[PDB]
């Protein structure tokens, strides 16, 4: 399985690994696929690059 997370820039390396452990776990259980077969990439950007509810987001 492949997973991708587009987030605003600013999260710490620690948060990102809590994210990957959290995401690999759930996808693994739901998929029956072992964690090692789950590819995961995080994509970062400026706050203005994200728009939620018609409004662009402020930098994180």
């Amino acid at each position: 399985p492949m997973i991708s997370c587009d987030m605003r820039y600013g999260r710490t390396d620690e948060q990102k690994r809590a994210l990957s452990a959290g995401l690999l776990r759930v996808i693994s259980e739901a998929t029956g696929e072992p964690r090692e077969n789950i590819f995961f990439v995080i994509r970062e950007g400026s706050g203005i690059n994200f728009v939620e509810h018609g409004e662009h987001l402020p930098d994180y």
Binding site: P1, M2, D6, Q15
Partner: protein, 57 residues
């Protein structure tokens, strides 16, 4: 966070809904992001269209 999950076909409509609700949950718990700004897109594929670590089905 906008999380896109590419998984193999086979899960039930109910298990997929649980999975969506779970990535949202574990995201909010690790990143602290509010569920109001969290977006999820689940997309299934035939096993054959997927290659992990260079493995060929």
């Amino acid at each position: 966070p906008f999380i896109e999950c590419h998984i193999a076909t086979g899960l039930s409509v109910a298990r997929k809904q649980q999975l969506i609700r779970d990535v949202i949950d574990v995201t909010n718990k690790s990143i602290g992001s509010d569920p109001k700004i969290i977006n999820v897109l689940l997309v299934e594929h035939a096993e054959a269209n997927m290659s992990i670590s260079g493995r060929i089905h």
